Amino acid sequence: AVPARRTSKAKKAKRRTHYKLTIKGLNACSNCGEMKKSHHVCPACGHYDGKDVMSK
Amino acid sequence: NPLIQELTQEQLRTDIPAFRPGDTVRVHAKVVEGTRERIQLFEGVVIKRRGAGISETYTVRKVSNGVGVERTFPLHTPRVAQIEVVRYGKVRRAKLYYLRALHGKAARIKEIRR
Amino acid sequence: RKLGRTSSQRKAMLRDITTDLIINERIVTTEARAKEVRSTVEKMITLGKRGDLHARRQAATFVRNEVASVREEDESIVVESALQKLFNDLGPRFAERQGGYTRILKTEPRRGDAAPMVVIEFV
Amino acid sequence: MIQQESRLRVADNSGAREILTIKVLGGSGRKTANIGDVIVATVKQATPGGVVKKGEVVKAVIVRTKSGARRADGSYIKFDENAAVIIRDDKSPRGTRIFGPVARELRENNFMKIVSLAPEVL
Amino acid sequence: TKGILGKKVGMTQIFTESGELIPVTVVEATPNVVLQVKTVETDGYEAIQVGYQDKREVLSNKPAKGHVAKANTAPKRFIKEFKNVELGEYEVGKEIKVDVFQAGDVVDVTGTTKGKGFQGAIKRHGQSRGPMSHGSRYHRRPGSMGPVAPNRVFKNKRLAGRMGGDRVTIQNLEVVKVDVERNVILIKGNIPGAKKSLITIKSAVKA
RNA sequence: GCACCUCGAUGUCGGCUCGUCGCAUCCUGGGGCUGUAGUCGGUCCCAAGGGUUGGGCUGUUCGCCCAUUAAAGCGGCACGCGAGCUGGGUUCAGAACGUCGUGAGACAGUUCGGUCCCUAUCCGUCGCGGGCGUUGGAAAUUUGAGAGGAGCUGUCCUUAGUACGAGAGGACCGGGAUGGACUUACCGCUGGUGUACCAGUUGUUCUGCCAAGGGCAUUGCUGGGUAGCUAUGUAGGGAAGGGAUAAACGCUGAAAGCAUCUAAGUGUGAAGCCCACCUCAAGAUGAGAUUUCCCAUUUCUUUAAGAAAGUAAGACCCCUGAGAGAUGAUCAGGUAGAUAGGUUGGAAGUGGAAGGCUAGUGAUAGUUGGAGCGGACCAAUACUAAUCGGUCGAGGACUUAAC
RNA sequence: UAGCGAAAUUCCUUGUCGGGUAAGUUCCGACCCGCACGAAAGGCGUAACGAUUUGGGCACUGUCUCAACGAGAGACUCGG
RNA sequence: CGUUAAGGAACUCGGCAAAAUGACCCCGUAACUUCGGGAGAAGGGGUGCUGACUUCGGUCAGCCGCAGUGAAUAGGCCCAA
RNA sequence: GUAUGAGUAGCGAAAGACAGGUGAGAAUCCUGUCCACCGUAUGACUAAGGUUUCCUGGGGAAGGCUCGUCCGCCCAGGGU
RNA sequence: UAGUGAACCAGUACCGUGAGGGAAAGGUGAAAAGCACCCCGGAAGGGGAGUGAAAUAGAUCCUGAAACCGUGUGCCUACAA
């Protein structure tokens, strides 16, 4: 159909309380202590389970 | 499957010969007509098996007085006296449904003496 | 299963990716493609243990015919053809290994589409 | 599975060959029928002569559908055609002979004069 | 009264002793620990808490162990009740074996149905189609929402929302075998439940 | 009938999907009277719980007709329902017949053909999540304030050829068996689908060739088919009872020495009301009940139900998943391991692999051999992947009475 | 006048009889009482022809009784 | 877009849409008529591979499959107004 | 000039996958390999019509329905 | 947004085969003295240091209202038509 009215400034914001970006698990490494993702290959470290994996 | 094939090792029948689909078979039934107990006789061609253990079934085709009659039996009934394998035939299909539109002398099966 | 595309296109996809790793032993792709390549590669190394004619004549499905891989000469130019590599190298590598010939590692999302990406290796 | 406007056959000496159904008597909206039920019907082909002609409201009884019956044993019957026998409301056939096999389950509903005239009761 | 929980295994066929095929469900049990006794002076009831399986001891909490510890057993998964039983005859820690349903044979069976997701308004309620040809455009839709005059929609004009996942009894079923060595009751018919789910089995109500 | 209402536009009839309400009731249920012997009936009172059919004829309403049934109700809801469908009908531009008109044209006269646009903002209705409260923090189990569902019915046997009647015919109240329509769950049987399962087979092209195979031709076409999802398949349901009533019938008894169901008193009495059966249910802010688990640093704002930080019991994030799923949720697991993949075996299913030998001039046939293959199904097995981790989360107010 | 005639014309009208169907106001054959057919704004037959209008049979079938399953695109989740 | 048990126009204003026929070769073919037509009227039979013999077309013998223009393309018919 | 609708509808019929380059940055640019589509045309030559889009070397603010180190786009030379 | 349509490279760009129709667009500072040099970044863009009486006069460059979009905070808000 066609919207009947202008929605006010209040119901702009009362929708958008579920329009967020959130960040999931951030572990710290072993070889550098740097904040990186759980279960993921540590990119700057190049290690995972203490192994030169991304090498080659 | 673990418990079921332990619960039904008991009502099975071991009296059953070996037969492929496409083998002429006599089947003794058991018919209750009030208090009587007749033993009928059916002769046809085996077409099916429904392989499942407890509840395997098979089929038979008469052609009697023009009309063809089909009857499916389960295996493990006590209301079947015997199963008499009569012939053996060249078949290459597991389920012979193409018999449907055939009439008489174009629905014959061959004989292998085995 | 995992539907990805139409019917015959999955056969094309998995013949593409699993005739790779026979040659390179590393592959960088997405997540779900890696899981289908798990299953199909490990089904096609157990034929590398047998060495029969049925080992060859069932490898006529998931092997691209004219695909080379050369680290080889004596005084010649002599060419392994990426199925010969199964029946001469990867068989005797995992002659004593049971199932589970692969690794899948989780690196990064792709820049173009935010598709998370994945490394496959063998040992 | 026999409904309105479905063609049966006749297995009698009563000069009819085929039949349409009209109704499926007994109930207030019954859809289907099986072996051993009563049909209101008409006569749409006829051998010449005979007692029963075209255009007649005729009751009949179903023998040998192409989808037979479970029995309490566990066995089934599947015939190949559809046939019927004409009845004078006494459960007594008009014609003399009956051709072809006949299912057993007419005995459960007192069709004894039909059953004792069949060549075979299956 | 007679109440036993348990699993759900499958479907078989059993010849009876006059030679008749009958479809049969396969329901297990185990020994069955009574956990509490609820009386009028404490809860205003008369009821009994029962429980059927063995968890690992990794998979529970301290309060679950504090419930279990008055009966000296393993911590369990499923815990339910039973109302309207003349008690006596029940202590904290007894076992209710499979033997209670020898040929009681008049039994209500409860479970939970399967789950089928979002589906159309046909597959719940059996509302029929519209015509698929002669030029229409109304194949598989849920009707009209009502009249005009009340300027709203009356409640319960049922529409598309998730199929299955609620608990359903079936009344007056029979019992065929009781296998005490294997803890299996066999029942004629069909039971609402997916495999491995719970089933409560009680003596029936309507005599 | 009137012309208040809508002309910067409030779209007709029938049919389809979906219903809901009223009772001046069509069937089933309880009754009074009869010019009611019996089975049938006629009339009137109570009663809305459920049910109320398929086809032929025009566009139909309306109606006529066939075959059934316990019955084939009357009405309201914009003569219910077109931002849900149809557009046949009546109301566009073409053309024709009859009639009228000198004529252009016209006719509730007829005949063929002729366009139905919309991405749902707000309320509404169906399903499903996040936040907070429930006065310390938690894990489970649960009365039921209220609400929703279901509510129909035929035929046969037996009392009994009995009571009734000249015969003709032929019961009430009871007991039992078995169907129709509707509806709740399920895949063991019968069947359907089953596009990463098995085989046959045509054309062309490719892997150098013979042999063996891949691509494409609607999945190439054809013959079968596991799990899963399914009905026309299976199993079950409406039972038996209770309390207060409706119409109707009394018992006792007077006002009125009698009579009389009523004013006092005291009963019988229906598919209807409230229970009885199935389900939802403490956001029932009147926020319920039980079981089990957990016990304390700093500065002062000065001790006020103060702030702040580490924790317990426990939960979450992240990861492997399906008996779950639009997403989130639910549920099975996370090395105290069988959660998924693989491996070794099976099973359903297909129906005799390759290679070699034998017989054939060949097309082919026989044997090695119930062979070879095997998507979801069943056991076993840490081989691969659930590494290492991080975040949140209590220290329990007052008044009175009782000991 | 001949020739037609409840018709692309007929209000009353679903005129009356016959045929076709279990049941046929639509169709075909006949009657004449043509509200208001008629001879070049032509009358009455007609082989062949027609993306023409109308009535009826065979074969076929998810149009239907009464639906069920599978494939692809959209729809749904995340990035632009 | 693909498949379907049993029934086969009951749906509907109306068989609208789908389904069914479809290639080559042989037999056979009505009423009616303006004699040219109707007429591909209707209704039926055959088709693969191997060997032998082919005057030429083909003929005979054998083998296999449910199915031999094995895929794609390729007319539904009749009765009346 | 700026809102609402709303970060919604849409992104204009098709088959891609990997390795190695270059680069601040890569599914989208280059190279290799195999796979796939048309093939009385999605192949070759020309008549109008368009008017420098053609070639060589550089660039990424805007155009390209996303991205872009690339282009029928921008800068500078040069060819008929 | 006045005054010619046009204070600016205007009957121009743009539209219609054609006759024809026809816009928008003024302002740094007194003087260009229009930010040497360092720092992050591929750049764009910014932060220092300078020029200038003034840089919130930095080339979209005098003053800079309203709708509209944001940040921070004194008080209120989860039984309410």
Ligand SMILES: [Zn+2]
């Ligand atoms: Zn690290």
